[PDB]
């Protein structure tokens, strides 16, 4: 575990993370995809060997010894708000199980279902709260990666408010 488990947020490409493992915002088919998924495919393409997994689950594949946790959030274009909310919460619970199983002291994590899978809605709070629900009982240092400067502000505020 980390000596004083923390949450942090950085505004940069998760493919340049400084953590012991990465969570991919994966598609269910293990395809190179778009956005975070494409960046992860370019950095760790070996991790896409048999990475296909259903919505609401996480599947870890090693790139060398570096674990890539493929977490499949729901596409809110296809799911109802209710069912999508359930699957988004479930994907993060599976990430917490994997992070725990791997014994890492740190994990880089994007906000699931906030990009192309958001169904064109702002899901920062919904996705971040499900991340906290899952990860709060883990003792890994969690570093959240985002690209938008105002998202960085809002995530940093949400972290600092519970401190
Ligand atoms: Cl960057
Ligand atoms: Cl997404
Ligand atoms: Cl963002």
From Swiss-Prot:
It comes from Chikungunya virus (strain S27-African prototype) (CHIKV). Interacts with mRNA-capping enzyme nsP1. Interacts (via C-terminus) with host G3BP1; this interaction inhibits the formation of host stress granules on viral mRNAs and the nsp3-G3BP1 complexes bind viral RNAs and probably orchestrate the assembly of viral replication complexes. Interacts (via C-terminus) with host G3BP2; this interaction inhibits the formation of host stress granules on viral mRNAs and the nsp3-G3BP2 complexes bind viral RNAs and probably orchestrate the assembly of viral replication complexes. Interacts (via C-terminus) with host NAP1L1. It is a peripheral membrane protein. Coiled coil: none annotated. ADP-D-ribose binds at residues 13, 27, 35, 115-117. Signal peptide: none annotated. It is found in: Host cytoplasmic vesicle membrane. Phosphorylated by host on serines and threonines. The lineage of its organism: Viruses, Riboviria, Orthornavirae, Kitrinoviricota, Alsuviricetes. Residues 4-163 form the Macro domain. This is Non-structural protein 3. In the N-terminus, the macro domain displays a mono-ADP-ribosylhydrolase activity. The central part called, the alphavirus unique domain (AUD) has a zinc-binding function. The C-terminus region, also called hypervariable domain (HVD), is mainly disordered and binds several host proteins. This intrinsically disordered domain contains 2 SH3 domain-binding sites and 2 FGDF motifs necessary and sufficient for the formation of nsP3/G3BP complexes. Seems to be essential for minus-strand RNAs and subgenomic 26S mRNAs synthesis. Displays mono-ADP-ribosylhydrolase activity. ADP-ribosylation is a post-translational modification that controls various processes of the host cell and the virus probably needs to revert it for optimal viral replication. Binds proteins of G3BP family and sequesters them into the viral RNA replication complexes thereby inhibiting the formation of host stress granules on viral mRNAs.
């Amino acid at each position: 575990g980390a000596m004083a488990p923390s949450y942090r947020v950085k505004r940069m490409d998760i493919a340049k993370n400084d953590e012991e493992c990465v969570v991919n915002a994966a598609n269910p088919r293990g395809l190179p995809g778009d956005g975070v998924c494409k960046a992860v495919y370019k950095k760790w393409p070996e991790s896409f060997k048999n990475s296909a997994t259903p919505v609401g689950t996480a599947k870890t594949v090693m790139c060398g010894t570096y674990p890539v946790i493929h977490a499949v959030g729901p596409n809110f274009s296809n799911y109802t708000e209710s069912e999508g909310d359930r699957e988004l919460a479930a994907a993060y619970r599976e990430v917490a199980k994997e992070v725990t199983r791997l014994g890492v002291n740190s994990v880089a994590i994007p906000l699931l279902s906030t990009g192309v899978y958001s169904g064109g809605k702002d899901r920062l709070t919904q996705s971040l709260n499900h991340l906290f629900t899952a990860m709060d009982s883990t003792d890994a240092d969690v570093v959240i990666y985002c690209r938008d400067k105002e998202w960085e502000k809002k995530i940093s505020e949400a972290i600092q408010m519970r401190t």
